Amino acid sequence: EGREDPQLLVRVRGGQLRGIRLKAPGGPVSAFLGIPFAEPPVGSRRFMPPEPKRPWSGVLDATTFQNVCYQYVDTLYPGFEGTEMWNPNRELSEDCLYLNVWTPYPRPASPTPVLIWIYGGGFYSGAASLDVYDGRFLAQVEGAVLVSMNYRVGTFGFLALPGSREAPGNVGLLDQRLALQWVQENIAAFGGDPMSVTLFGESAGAASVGMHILSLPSRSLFHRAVLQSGTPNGPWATVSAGEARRRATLLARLVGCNDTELIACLRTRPAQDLVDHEWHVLPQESIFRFSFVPVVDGDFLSDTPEALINTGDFQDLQVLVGVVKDEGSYFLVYGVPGFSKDNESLISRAQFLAGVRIGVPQASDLAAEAVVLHYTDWLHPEDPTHLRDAMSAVVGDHNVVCPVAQLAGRLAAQGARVYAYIFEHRASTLTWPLWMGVPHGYEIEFIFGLPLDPSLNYTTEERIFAQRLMKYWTNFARTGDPNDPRDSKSPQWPPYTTAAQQYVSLNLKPLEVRRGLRAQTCAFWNRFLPKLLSA
Amino acid sequence: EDPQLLVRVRGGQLRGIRLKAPGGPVSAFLGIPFAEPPVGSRRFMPPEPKRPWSGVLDATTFQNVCYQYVDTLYPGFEGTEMWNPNRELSEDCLYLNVWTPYPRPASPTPVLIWIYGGGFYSGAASLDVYDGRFLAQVEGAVLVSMNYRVGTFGFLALPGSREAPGNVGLLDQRLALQWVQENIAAFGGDPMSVTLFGESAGAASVGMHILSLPSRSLFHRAVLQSGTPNGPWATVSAGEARRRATLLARLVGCNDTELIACLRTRPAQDLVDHEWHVLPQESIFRFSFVPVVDGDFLSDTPEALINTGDFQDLQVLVGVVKDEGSYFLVYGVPGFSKDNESLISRAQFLAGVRIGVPQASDLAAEAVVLHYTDWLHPEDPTHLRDAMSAVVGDHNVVCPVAQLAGRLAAQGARVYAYIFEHRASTLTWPLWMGVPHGYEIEFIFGLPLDPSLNYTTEERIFAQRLMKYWTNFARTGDPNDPRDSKSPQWPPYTTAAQQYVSLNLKPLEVRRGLRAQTCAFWNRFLPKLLSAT
Ligand SMILES: NC(=O)c1cc[n+](COC[n+]2ccc(/C=N/O)cc2/C=N/O)cc1
Numbered sequence A: 001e002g003r004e005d006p007q008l009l010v011r012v013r014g015g016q017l018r019g020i021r022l023k024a025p026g027g028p029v030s031a032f033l034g035i036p037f038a039e040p041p042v043g044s045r046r047f048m049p050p051e052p053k054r055p056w057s058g059v060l061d062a063t064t065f066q067n068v069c070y071q072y073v074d075t076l077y078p079g080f081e082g083t084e085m086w087n088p089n090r091e092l093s094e095d096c097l098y099l100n101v102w103t104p105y106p107r108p109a110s111p112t113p114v115l116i117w118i119y120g121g122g123f124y125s126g127a128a129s130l131d132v133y134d135g136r137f138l139a140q141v142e143g144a145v146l147v148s149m150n151y152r153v154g155t156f157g158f159l160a161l162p163g164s165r166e167a168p169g170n171v172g173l174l175d176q177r178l179a180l181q182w183v184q185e186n187i188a189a190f191g192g193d194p195m196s197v198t199l200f201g202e203s204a205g206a207a208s209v210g211m212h213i214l215s216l217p218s219r220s221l222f223h224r225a226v227l228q229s230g231t232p233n234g235p236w237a238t239v240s241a242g243e244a245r246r247r248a249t250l251l252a253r254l255v256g257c258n259d260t261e262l263i264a265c266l267r268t269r270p271a272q273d274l275v276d277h278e279w280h281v282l283p284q285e286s287i288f289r290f291s292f293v294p295v296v297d298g299d300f301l302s303d304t305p306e307a308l309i310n311t312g313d314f315q316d317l318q319v320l321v322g323v324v325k326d327e328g329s330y331f332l333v334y335g336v337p338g339f340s341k342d343n344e345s346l347i348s349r350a351q352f353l354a355g356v357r358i359g360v361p362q363a364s365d366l367a368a369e370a371v372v373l374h375y376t377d378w379l380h381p382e383d384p385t386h387l388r389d390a391m392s393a394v395v396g397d398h399n400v401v402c403p404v405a406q407l408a409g410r411l412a413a414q415g416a417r418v419y420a421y422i423f424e425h426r427a428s429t430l431t432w433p434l435w436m437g438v439p440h441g442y443e444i445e446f447i448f449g450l451p452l453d454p455s456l457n458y459t460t461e462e463r464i465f466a467q468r469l470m471k472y473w474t475n476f477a478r479t480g481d482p483n484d485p486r487d488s489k490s491p492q493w494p495p496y497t498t499a500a501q502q503y504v505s506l507n508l509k510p511l512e513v514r515r516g517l518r519a520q521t522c523a524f525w526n527r528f529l530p531k532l533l534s535a
Numbered sequence B: 001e002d003p004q005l006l007v008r009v010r011g012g013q014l015r016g017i018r019l020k021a022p023g024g025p026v027s028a029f030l031g032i033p034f035a036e037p038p039v040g041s042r043r044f045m046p047p048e049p050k051r052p053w054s055g056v057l058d059a060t061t062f063q064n065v066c067y068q069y070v071d072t073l074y075p076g077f078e079g080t081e082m083w084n085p086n087r088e089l090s091e092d093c094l095y096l097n098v099w100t101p102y103p104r105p106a107s108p109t110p111v112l113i114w115i116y117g118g119g120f121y122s123g124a125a126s127l128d129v130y131d132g133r134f135l136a137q138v139e140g141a142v143l144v145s146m147n148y149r150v151g152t153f154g155f156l157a158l159p160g161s162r163e164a165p166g167n168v169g170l171l172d173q174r175l176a177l178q179w180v181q182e183n184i185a186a187f188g189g190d191p192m193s194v195t196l197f198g199e200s201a202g203a204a205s206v207g208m209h210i211l212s213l214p215s216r217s218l219f220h221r222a223v224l225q226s227g228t229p230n231g232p233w234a235t236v237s238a239g240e241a242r243r244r245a246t247l248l249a250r251l252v253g254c255n256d257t258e259l260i261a262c263l264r265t266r267p268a269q270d271l272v273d274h275e276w277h278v279l280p281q282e283s284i285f286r287f288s289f290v291p292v293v294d295g296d297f298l299s300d301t302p303e304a305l306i307n308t309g310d311f312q313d314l315q316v317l318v319g320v321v322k323d324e325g326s327y328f329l330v331y332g333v334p335g336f337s338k339d340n341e342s343l344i345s346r347a348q349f350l351a352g353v354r355i356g357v358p359q360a361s362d363l364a365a366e367a368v369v370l371h372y373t374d375w376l377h378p379e380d381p382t383h384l385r386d387a388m389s390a391v392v393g394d395h396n397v398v399c400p401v402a403q404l405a406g407r408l409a410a411q412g413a414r415v416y417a418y419i420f421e422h423r424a425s426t427l428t429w430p431l432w433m434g435v436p437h438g439y440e441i442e443f444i445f446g447l448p449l450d451p452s453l454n455y456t457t458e459e460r461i462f463a464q465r466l467m468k469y470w471t472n473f474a475r476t477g478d479p480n481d482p483r484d485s486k487s488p489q490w491p492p493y494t495t496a497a498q499q500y501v502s503l504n505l506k507p508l509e510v511r512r513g514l515r516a517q518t519c520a521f522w523n524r525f526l527p528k529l530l531s532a533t
């Protein structure tokens, strides 16, 4: 204070922050990285809801990203950029309840709609500091205020002994909520408009967006929601209390540990230890299942997300939801024998039948067989390309595409304004093999405008496309309508309705309007497969 | 005394009639007895060979139609009456007809034996659509069609009983086949090129002869139009037969002997009267008295027999029409009538599915419903109505044909498949029914060649192709024109390629996968579903 840049000093409820002038392609952005928003959920506060960050004295340095929440680091393909980019890029620490604010520089004159990013990562990983989450471009180019919060992933954030006091579960969501509160209270200090807060996120982040939609206390904290390749409903995003309990207790067992005693013990265990074992607690060989995820606690989540979407009403809600061309593929290389990033993963019907059990771990044989039955191309039932692609499709449809359909469906049905997309563009920079197509999580860098960074080798059409997506997103943030209110030479993105089921393709090509998110196959997943469990 | 019209078969002498076919004359020997009238004590009994007769049996007129339900749902309406008996009903109806070229062909000629449909409860070999004159004249075929007992008379089985062993309508047919073997040379027929062909139940029977050992020496090729021995309707288990028999017997006021005797006492029409009360569910495309897995004629389930059989010295021509199921929707599926577009509501669809797949558990019905629902257009009646048509067609004919065509090929039979896509210009059912069950027969039999029938000339030409495929198939085991390169070729249906041709007014187009996905559902998952629940 005195010699430094007047435009980078902001006070927030917790006290004084000094941010950083960051270079974006189009010019400078204000950045306030690693702002604490909670008391470090450390020591005795492990598993506990976050507590509001106690005000600090002097100026907090908000110039660099803070610690990433303690998490499993993926090491299946070490060195590989396609997994590296998701890996923590800051120190792993339980003290990681920090959030990031990008805004134009200078900060916007008039209150500016807020985008709050919630990262995915299966609820066991992710960090708002990942390069693909860099909000400088949306800040710079769209003049948006962008906020991303770390929240506790894995056990630290989602280990629950439901009903207990010391590990009530969902605290990762509560961290998220707490940041959302933080934005309400503090965002105006940055020229953010607390009255125009959009949540967007992807994979688990989307599920988290969704759960905020579905959780009353969160509802007053944002106005519009974007769920990219994630939904709070679906087989992966939550667990029953019983399952949470069973997993928490087994994880306990596995590290050597009445809920207090158990949790107390868990709290004496080193972070790493918990991480080291978080994945041993899954009931089956699974892909796209994660150990510690939001629990249906009958608190944060009053009931199952399934119920909550089926029955709640979503009047004041505008929701942009969508999927990528290939939700499944990514998950295939991490547990489905046959699959790899290093070959074309042409599998056998055996390997498929197998992968279906892994992909749909919750399936009884009959269910699994229905899956196989549905996805087999009965012309080419032995066809490795088809089976590989089917396997992709199964995992993607089951965990992402169909829940998204269900979600957009029920949401529209219940008077929410829903825009739907399928993002069909494969980053020209993608390092995954062509077979994986546009895999889970690979629209994010476009939404964020990474292509705008010339030093990132994206093609010029990827820059144009990036701005387009950024337009959509920020338009949607701004108005609850991704559409450019002026510009109408460009085709409209109709709301997804139950009657029309319209959604747009997001390619390099202009918006193509399609009907039915896998309407047919999703009938299978959303309508039939449930009934096949009931017997 | 035209000696062309004069044949001596084993049983004595026949006087045929010289019939005019559009391109010349044919010898028709109609009303030829091939079994002792299955009357009186003989009712429900296997047919015994007709006793020899004195003098010259007038064989110029069709004989009685086997005693069957006459359909009344739309009286006077050509669309239904065309299937109704066009002769006097009578249990005394074990006669076959032979058309031949006139003159009697010089060299032994491939015989096609037609087995009519009629759900095993009706049909007759005298109906115009089974007129063998065209195939005799145009294609030089010796064409035989028998009557075989239908309904209770042909198929009321008290399995294991002496006096209603079951499958006697099939035995009737087997007898006609023996009769052809024993007699057809006398007509110029080649008892070494006998091709059975038939539709609906006529196909199931054709298939049942494929599946029945005694029948195998009685034909070489088989053509199964729009029906199969496998599948939901063509057979019943012994227990279900017994059940329906005993039930029918209850309904007409009656150990097996003591019961059959009583059924024996009953005027035909009394049996026919109650023939329908005996279906376990409010069904469609389900018939009360059908061949029974008796462990005898059918040593095991057609599925068992088609899964496990060896079929490598067998050629089969199988196919379906575009709308197998539609026809059946008007006969018990609320909301369907030939007298509107039958645009149904979602509810009527879920309902018209427990009637179409009557044996479905709610789960299986739901399975069917979710499968057939166009989720882009979930409530659009045009779809629901077509899906209904589809459900019933696929369930009953298409997919059964699929499994059959698949199993036969797998197990070494040479198989040709088709989907018949041409709707007759003269069709009397409304358009929404498309190409209903049964409506390729007119074409195969070459009826469009009779100019007085007001078939378009493009249909005349089509009929001719079909007759040519069928008779080529009859001649050679291969429907393809054995000299004629300007194609395309009808490839054998194989389990790999699953190729089959559309028969329509365009040239053959080869499609692959006979509703592969949908039949997957029907032939793979549905069994598993009910096979648990
Ligand atoms: N802690 C866990 O539950 C866990 C940890 C690691 N994996 C495997 O990491 C592979 N991987 C890598 C990236 C993603 C994407 N997440 O949004 C998902 C996955 C999981 N597939 O089953 C699964 C579960």
Ligand SMILES: NC(=O)c1cc[n+](COC[n+]2ccc(/C=N/O)cc2/C=N/O)cc1
Residues within 6 Å of the ligand: B069, B071, B083, B117, B118, B119, B121, B151, B200, B201, B275, B276, B283, B284, B285, B286, B287, B288, B289, B328, B331, B437
């Ligand atoms: N005896 C019976 O089981 C019976 C009698 C009459 N019908 C009604 O006739 C309508 N109909 C008319 C023609 C056909 C075609 N058969 O190949 C089939 C059907 C049956 N649909 O459920 C059905 C069963």
